Amino acid sequence: VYADSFVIRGDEVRQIAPGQTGNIADYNYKLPDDFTGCVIAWNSNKLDS
Amino acid sequence: FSRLDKVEAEVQIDRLITGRLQSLQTYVTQQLIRAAEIRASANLAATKM
């Protein structure tokens, strides 16, 4: 099992899903086509911001 | 493949591929029947020879 974590803009959460293009999902990191697993996304305003 | 996402569209082409094989299957079935009929006539032709 592999856990890959980071902090991303709250608007473009759906770009994490495979097949979505753009700049944060093309020029930074993208999932493979047959990816198995899933992502967890949540707000960080009190701590990080 | 080109217009929309790759993940969702696969069952779409699967629909297509199934139909094509189905069509092909139907065609070959008819040929067998015709062949059998022709074969019977051919055997009768042999008797006529």
Interface contacts (A, B; CB < 8 Å): 6
Contacts of B6 in chain A (CB under 8 A): 19, 33
- For A14, the enclosing helix (H) or strand (E) is none
Put simply, the answer to whether A33 touches B7 (Cβ < 8 Å) is: yes
Cβ atoms of A22 and A15 closer than 8 Å? yes
Question: What number of helices (H) and strands (E) belong to chain B?
Answer: 1, 0
d(CA A17, CA A37): 11
Residue bearing tokens 């629909």 = B15
Chain CA centroid to CA A39, Å:
7
d(CA B4, CA B17): 18
Residue bearing tokens 């092909």 = B24
Beta carbons within 8 Å of A31's beta carbon, 6+ residues apart: A16, A17, A18
What residue type is assigned to position B8 of the chain?
E
d(CA B40, CA B30): 16
End-to-end CA distance of chain A: 30
d(CA A41, CA A12): 11
- Which tokens is A26 given? 């093309």
| Resolution as reported, in Å | 4.0
d(CA B13, CA B7): 11
Interchain contact A10–B (C-beta under 8 A) = no
d(CA B41, CA B31): 15
